[PDB]
Amino acid sequence: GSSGSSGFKAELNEFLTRELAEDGYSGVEVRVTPTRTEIIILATRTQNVLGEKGRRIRELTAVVQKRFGFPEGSVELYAEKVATRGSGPSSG
Known part of the structure; x- marks a missing residue:
């Protein structure tokens, strides 16, 4: 995914920035599929x-479900870890 117009992602990023302030937030990714919406914090x-x-992810699912109106089983919440581009696997 990439920055630009998209509506939801900006509101949700504003929301999560507060929620995860000390936790170590950075941003989020989103997908919307023929099956569900997907939300992947970074x-x-x-x-x-x-x-x-x-x-916290279970609770954050429920609050997001309420705030944004998501159907259940049709929002999924995930967490990705931050990591630089660059470097190798091991190179040996």
């Missing part, structure tokens, strides 16, 4: 954003 520490056995 943060320094994915475990904090998940919380204790997925606590």
Whole structure:
């Protein structure tokens, strides 16, 4: 995905920036498929954003569901970790 017009992603990024302020947020990616919407936060520490056995992600699903009006089973919430472009796998 890439920056530009898209509406939802800007509201959701504004939302999550507050939610995950100290947690280590950066941004989010989104997909919308013939099957569901997908929401993929980008943060320094994915475990904090998940919380204790997925606590925070489950709650953040419900609040997003309420705020944005998502149908259940048709929003999915994921967490990606931040990592630079560049470097190798191992090169040996």
